Design a protein around this ligand. Structure first.
Ligand SMILES: CCCCCCCCCCCCCCCCCC(=O)OC[C@H](COP(=O)([O-])OCC(O)COP(=O)([O-])OC[C@@H](COC(=O)CCCCCCCCCCCCCCCCC)OC(=O)CCCCCCCCCCCCCCCCC)OC(=O)CCCCCCCCCCCCCCCCC
Ligand code: BCL
Ligand code: BCL
Ligand SMILES: CC[C@H]1c2cc3[nH]c4c(c3C)C(=O)[C@H](C(=O)OC)c4c3nc(cc4[nH]c(cc(n2)[C@@H]1C)c(C(C)=O)c4C)[C@@H](C)[C@@H]3CCC(=O)OC/C=C(\C)CCC[C@H](C)CCC[C@H](C)CCCC(C)C
Ligand SMILES: CC[C@H]1c2cc3[nH]c4c(c3C)C(=O)[C@H](C(=O)OC)c4c3nc(cc4[nH]c(cc(n2)[C@@H]1C)c(C(C)=O)c4C)[C@@H](C)[C@@H]3CCC(=O)OC/C=C(\C)CCC[C@H](C)CCC[C@H](C)CCCC(C)C
Ligand SMILES: COC1=C(OC)C(=O)C(C/C=C(\C)CC/C=C(\C)CC/C=C(\C)CC/C=C(\C)CC/C=C(\C)CC/C=C(\C)CC/C=C(\C)CC/C=C(\C)CC/C=C(\C)CCC=C(C)C)=C(C)C1=O
Ligand SMILES: COC1=C(OC)C(=O)C(C/C=C(\C)CC/C=C(\C)CC/C=C(\C)CC/C=C(\C)CC/C=C(\C)CC/C=C(\C)CC/C=C(\C)CC/C=C(\C)CC/C=C(\C)CCC=C(C)C)=C(C)C1=O
Ligand SMILES: COC(C)(C)C(=O)C/C=C(\C)CC/C=C(\C)CC/C=C(\C)CCCC/C(C)=C/CCC(C)CC/C=C(\C)CCC=C(C)C
Ligand SMILES: CCCCCCCCCCCC[N+](C)(C)[O-]
Ligand SMILES: CCCCCCCCCCCC[N+](C)(C)[O-]
Ligand SMILES: CCCCCCCCCCCC[N+](C)(C)[O-]
Ligand SMILES: CCCCCCCCCCCC
Ligand SMILES: CCCCCCCCCCCC
Ligand SMILES: CCCCCCCCCCCC
Ligand SMILES: CCCCCCCCCCCC
Ligand SMILES: CCCCCCCCCCCC
Ligand SMILES: [Fe+3]
Lengths: 281, 240, 300
């Protein structure tokens, strides 16, 4: 079935691979070659997870956990029950995410739109691969990666962080957080602004974008504009993920001590290091 | 235990919220249709919401949604297969017929108005006090298509007055008439404006505007549709 | 070309805004124009509206900030080199548990915290009032104020409601860069790890989800900006090919989609629920649940 306005856009073309071979839909879903790839990678991944479930011995969604190889294994392969499944599931997951992106690219070409969405999604993929591929490789073992389990992955977040003290002190992490918080602020504001204009007080006519600009100028003395706010939200959300990936790629590689102690470089600068008073003299 | 009650209550709230939001996002495009325009049997588990009515400014009426959905234009496409879910091939030239990535919607054939009832978009020459404030001024540059042939020259910028942004370049062709090109589909360089989506021979085919100092929402859609469509449909002449 | 930065800027006469029922006496003149900002958003700074509530809010806000800073200068021995060296380590701390909810603590050991907090309380609530009142004067809905209230809720819970219910101001957040992070860490340790608080986990899903949402939505609008997609209010009133292509991108990708109005409803709620769920999580911590790990083992 189609939305009322949809048929006119369902023309041939846009595919990157396969010509017309996979150029069709299933219900709402576009397929394409990268849709077949996504199905394959995702189905195999899910099957292997369900299998890894049995080798654990359990069917509860909030117990199933697939652990990477132990540190002993370095960057080598591991028997399926002792990390090998995690390694295969990880390749499947990467294959499915990249395939999903590339299928997004095909949909953009068919629709004649910009490639911004899959570009954006690639940042999430890069963050994932930071945690499961890049960071582990730079550190010498698959075992530094997170396990795939609902609760077990939080265990890993918590142990990984407390390895360096309070992880708050990671300065890339501060920047990342700042972006996440700011993005939520901006998303709240933007949503609310558009809706306050489209849904005014009871009598009244729909407000215009000029009213929206006027509201924000009255409030904070500035209006970024309708193009600007979408640029901003994209930048804030991508910046949060970029700095997320940065904050972890540097941790256990370039810096592996207690993150609080990093800040000593500032307090030790020679012009004020030895001055009496304050918290540090 | 109060925390148990709060979390149980929250999941109930969340489910209702999601139901509400999905129904709010069915105010356009629904009911679903079969490929022949007829109502589809399976609409899914979410019913259409109660209509709402937006009161438009400057006496332009109302919009009530959901309401009866109509393309209000002919659609030059035909099936390529004997069952659902395959593509629909253009029956003539898809750029001229406005299908596929060249599609346009039958928007109102009036200009968008600012908060004061004046036209939102104006050629800069008619917009008092407006000028280029930073960056390369494209006015006067040759315009080059994806075939690396010169299609025309830029004679003005069409600007959004309340936003103070450039929205189109007005390009004059060999015959002396002009076309609008969306600002998002041009590359302003030091000695040219380059247009990837269109070869030089496709510029004349850009839909034209009725009044030479305003553009209607319908006309914007046809212009933007058409230049976007060139990305797929100018396969006879494109290079880097 | 991607539409992240503009290629050409234009400028014309300053936009002084819509009038509606706004009192123009309270609105400043226009600020200057920034070419720098203009690569990304609009160049125009101001005008701003400053009625009586705004002056009050700005003043208590600054008084909050100056109270913290006077304390920081004191802590630095009035020495600028030390002030800069130690800036992130200074902290204006609340009264000790001994003083309960009373105002009897000395300035140097809690009283200044209460003074700064009073000023903050007045600043934020008067700014909330302003959020409502500026919308009203323009005939707009109150979505901004309802949204802002969700943020205020977490803030209130942390510095006011939760301390009151726990019997002491000692329980509130200190004013300092490092010290408030230490407080945050410590809050989690003391309540048996906040990862077992189901409301904290919801808060995270919403926080991550807001980045998901705005990345999706910002990217989508920029991708259809070649059809004027960022003119959202007009696409609401009169759907165009921008809105159709946007919807259809997502329909074809994940099997369903939004409208140009409705995506803003998805948006506002994704964001508002961060601090809604957050404040509940915090409010329940120590009042009703002393240890989230324990609570998790029972759900009770
Ligand atoms: C304790 C925590 C305390 C924390 C306090 C902070 C509160 C923060 C609130 C967040 C505000 C963001 C939402 C903005 C918004 O859209 O509403 C604007 C709305 C009106 O704005 P306006 O400018 O005055 O009107 C302009 C237009 O005319 C009209 O404007 P409009 O049409 O654009 O907006 C219409 C709005 C109008 O909203 C209303 O009139 C109020 C209706 C809300 C009912 C809330 C139920 C609460 C349940 C308790 C859950 C506890 C969890 C623990 O519609 C909704 O948003 C409806 C939300 C749907 C919720 C459905 C939940 C049902 C549960 C049952 C399901 C069973 C499932 C079985 C399995 O503001 C509100 O009414 C407040 C919202 C309260 C929601 C709760
Ligand atoms: C006790 C723990 C430590 C700590 C240790 C850590 C550690 C360790 C890490 C973080 C990371 C982060 N922390 Mg920290 N952190 C702490 C305290 C905090 C606080 C706080 C208020 O106190 C905040 C706000 C944050 C904030 C953050 C973010 C900056 C960052 C997480 C987001 C991210 O990387 O997304 C990136 C997004 C992804 C990885 C998701 C990718 C999704 C993929 C591409 C697609 C999946 C599809 C899915 C399978 C499909 C399912 C199918 C269905 C149909 C849907 N931390 C405490 C002090 N923090 C992480 C980070 O930076 O990671 C890079 C990280 O590893
Ligand atoms: C070691 C630390 C603990 C921990 C301890 C806590 C504690 C404690 C809290 C959180 C809270 C949160 N944590 Mg945690 N957190 C941890 C690990 C994490 C991780 C992770 C990857 O490990 C993540 C992603 C998070 C994520 C989150 C957020 C979802 C949530 C904050 C929402 C928000 O927007 O707040 C930021 C928004 C506000 C504070 C609103 C402020 C609004 C006011 C009105 C603004 C006034 C401005 C003022 C006047 C200044 C003026 C400025 C000028 C105008 C310029 N935490 C670990 C386990 N976390 C909070 C929460 O809700 O928890 C349930 C909270 O209290
Ligand atoms: C970069 C900015 C932010 C962002 C952006 C972003 N995400 C996106 C996109 C964009 C632009 C999309 O276009 C795309 C989309 O389609 O969204 C609806 C996507 C997407 N983001 C998703 C999730 C997601 N994004 C997150 C984060 C973020 N996404 C950022 C904060 C998170 C977090 C923070 O945790 C999650 C969970 C998906 C909904 C969707 C991508 C769907 C996809 O790739 O589908 C194909 C694959 C499958 C259907 C299943 C694969 C199954 C695997 C083979 C097995 C499972 C392995 C896995 C590693 C197990 C993990 C277990 C956990 C308990 C840890
Ligand atoms: C829904 C959850 C998210 C959210 C939403 C949200 N926040 C909001 C709103 C909304 C909907 C508003 O309407 C409101 C707003 O006005 O935004 C622009 C606000 C707001 N959120 C703010 C901050 C903020 N929000 C945060 C978080 C969040 N806000 C969440 C992620 C955080 C975090 C992450 O910790 C912060 C720090 C403020 C920018 C603004 C509320 C302003 C306020 O209450 O101000 C009081 C007055 C003062 C603070 C003035 C003191 C000045 C400064 C301390 C220093 C100097 C600057 C000064 C202004 C210069 C003056 C010059 C003089 C010479 C005249
Ligand atoms: C309908 O349309 C719409 C409009 O138009 C009509 C509009 O106008 C608007 C209104 C929008 C605005 C006016 C814009 C609002 C702006 C914001 C929400 C904020 C933007 C701010 C930034 C760009 C800054 C973000 C980044 C931050 C905060 C990171 C930095 C912060 C720190 C303190 C980090 C500290 C790091 C440390 C400690 C050290 C690191 C050291 C090293 C050496 C490394 C809306 C909503 C809209 O919807
Ligand atoms: C203004 O414009 C805009 C629109 O339009 C007007 C939009 O709609 C949207 C899109 C936004 C929404 C609709 C809001 C809701 C979005 C979220 C809250 C984000 C989270 C989304 C999900 C949790 C859904 C996840 C769905 C996925 C990943 C697909 C699941 C699919 C299946 C169950 C089937 C499996 C498919 C596979 C494996 C293979 C692929 C296909 C084949 C058949 C092969 C945005 C951003 C927008 O800005
Ligand atoms: C350069 O030097 C000068 C002097 C010019 C300065 O001005 C410098 C100034 C500084 C260096 C300022 C520094 C400021 C900070 C570092 C501030 C840090 C702020 C935080 C990180 C704050 C975090 C969280 C705050 C919270 C959660 C507060 C909540 C408060 C309340 C809910 C208010 C509660 C009200 C109370 C307790 C009093 C109520 C009493 C009644 C009678 C109603
Ligand atoms: C985090 C989950 C939020 C997403 C909610 C998903 C519900 C979408 C289902 C819509 C069905 C589409 N139909 C059949 C109406 O087109
Ligand atoms: C605007 C609606 C978006 C809905 C997204 C909800 C995702 C749920 C994530 C599971 C959280 C689990 N916890 C923390 C309750 O255990
Ligand atoms: C494992 C839990 C994940 C929950 C999220 C599932 C939401 C998928 C919605 C897809 C709806 C598409 N359909 C079926 C309408 O085409
Ligand atoms: C997806 C995570 C499921 C956890 C829900 C717990 C319900 C209480
Ligand atoms: C994402 C699924 C969580 C549902 C928990 C329901 C408990 C009632
Ligand atoms: C992610 C979707 C959440 C749906 C919650 C349903 C639980 C009802 C009890
Ligand atoms: C994927 C999660 C879908 C949850 C939606 C359930 C809606 C419940 C109906 C409540 C009737 C008011
Ligand atoms: C995909 C979620 C279906 C939930 C529908 C429930 C409506 C009653
Ligand atoms: Fe938007």
């Amino acid at each position: 079935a189609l939305l009322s306005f949809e048929r006119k856009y369902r023309v041939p073309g846009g595919t990157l691979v396969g010509g017309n071979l996979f150029d069709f839909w299933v219900g709402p879903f576009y397929v394409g070659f990268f849709g077949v790839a996504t199905f394959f990678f995702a189905a195999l991944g899910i099957i292997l997870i369900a299998w890894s479930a049995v080798l654990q011995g359990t069917w509860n969604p909030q117990l199933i956990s697939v652990y990477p190889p132990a540190l002993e294994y370095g960057l080598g392969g591991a028997p399926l029950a002792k990390g090998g499944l995690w390694q295969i599931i990880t390749i499947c997951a990467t294959g499915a995410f990249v395939s999903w992106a590339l299928r997004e690219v095909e949909i953009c070409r068919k629709l004649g739109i910009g490639y911004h969405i899959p570009f954006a999604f690639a940042f999430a993929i890069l963050a994932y691969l930071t945690l499961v591929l890049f960071r582990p490789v730079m550190m010498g073992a698959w075992g530094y990666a997170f396990p795939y389990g609902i609760w077990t992955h939080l265990d890993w977040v918590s142990n990984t962080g407390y390895t360096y003290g309070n992880f708050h002190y990671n300065p890339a992490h501060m920047i990342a957080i700042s972006f996440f918080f700011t993005n939520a602020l901006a998303l709240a504001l933007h949503g609310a602004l558009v809706l306050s204009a489209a849904n005014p007080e009871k009598g009244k006519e729909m407000r215009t974008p000029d009213h929206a600009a006027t509201f924000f100028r009255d409030l904070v003395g500035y209006s970024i504009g309708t193009l600007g706010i979408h640029r901003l939200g994209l930048l804030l959300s991508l910046s949060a993920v970029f700095f997320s990936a940065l904050c972890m790629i540097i941790t256990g590689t370039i810096w592996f001590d207690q993150w609080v102690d990093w800040w000593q470089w500032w307090v030790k600068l020679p012009w004020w290091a030895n001055i009496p008073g304050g918290i540090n003299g | 235990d109060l925390a148990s009650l709060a979390i149980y209550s929250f999941w109930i709230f969340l489910a209702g919220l999601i139901y509400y939001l999905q129904t709010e996002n069915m105010r356009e495009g629904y009911p679903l249709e079969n490929e022949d325009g007829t109502p589809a049997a399976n609409q899914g588990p979410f019913p259409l919401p109660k209509p709402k009515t937006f009161i438009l400014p400057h006496g332009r009426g109302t919009l009530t949604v959901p309401g009866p959905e109509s393309e209000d234009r002919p659609i030059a496409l035909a099936r390529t297969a004997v069952s659902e879910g395959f593509p629909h091939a253009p029956t003539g030239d898809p750029m001229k017929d406005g299908v596929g990535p060249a599609s346009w919607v039958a928007r109102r054939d009036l200009p968008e108005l600012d908060g004061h009832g004046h036209n939102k978009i104006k050629p800069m020459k008619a917009a008092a006090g407006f000028h280029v404030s930073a960056g390369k001024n494209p006015i006067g540059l040759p315009v080059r298509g994806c075939d690396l042939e010169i299609a025309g020259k830029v004679v003005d910028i069409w600007v959004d007055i309340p936003e103070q942004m450039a929205r189109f370049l007005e390009v004059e062709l060999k015959d002396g008439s002009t076309r609008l090109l969306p600002m998002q589909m041009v590359k302003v360089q030091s000695n040219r404006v380059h247009v990837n989506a269109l070869s030089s021979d496709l510029f004349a085919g850009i839909p034209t505007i009725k009044s030479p100092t305003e553009v209607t929402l319908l006309e914007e859609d046809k212009i933007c549709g058409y230049v976007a469509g060139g990305l797929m449909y100018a396969a006879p002449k494109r290079k880097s | 070309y991607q539409n992240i930065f503009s290629q050409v800027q234009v400028r014309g006469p300053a936009d002084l805004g819509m009038t509606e029922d706004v009192n123009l006496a309270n609105r400043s003149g226009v600020g200057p124009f920034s070419t720098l900002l203009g690569w990304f958003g609009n160049a125009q700074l101001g005008p701003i509206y400053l009625g009586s509530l705004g002056v009050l809010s700005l003043f208590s806000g600054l008084m909050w900030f100056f109270t913290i800073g006077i304390w920081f200068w004191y802590q630095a021995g009035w020495n600028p080199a030390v002030f800069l060296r130690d800036l992130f380590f200074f902290s204006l701390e609340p009264p000790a548990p001994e003083y309960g909810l009373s105002f009897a603590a000395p300035l140097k050991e809690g009283g200044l915290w209460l003074i700064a907090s009073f000023f903050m309380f007045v600043a934020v609530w008067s700014w909330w009032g302003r959020t409502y009142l500026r919308a009203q004067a323009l005939g707009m809905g109150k979505h901004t104020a309802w949204a802002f209230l969700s943020a205020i809720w977490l803030w209130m819970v942390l510095g006011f409601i939760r301390p009151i219910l726990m019997g002491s101001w000692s329980e509130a957040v200190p004013y300092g860069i490092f010290s408030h992070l230490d407080w945050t860490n410590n809050f989690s340790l003391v309540h048996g790890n906040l990862f077992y608080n189901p409301f904290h986990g919801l808060s995270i899903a919403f926080l991550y989800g807001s980045a998901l949402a705005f990345a999706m939505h910002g990217a989508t609008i920029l991708a259809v900006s070649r059809f004027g997609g960022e003119r959202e209010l007009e696409q609401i009133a009169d759907r165009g090919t921008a809105a159709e292509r946007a919807a259809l991108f997502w329909r074809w990708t994940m099997g369903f989609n939004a409208t140009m109005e409705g995506i803003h409803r998805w948006a506002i709620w994704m964001a508002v629920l961060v601090t809604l769920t957050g404040g509940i999580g915090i409010l329940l911590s120590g009042t009703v649940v002393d240890n989230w790990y324990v609570w998790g083992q029972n759900h009770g």
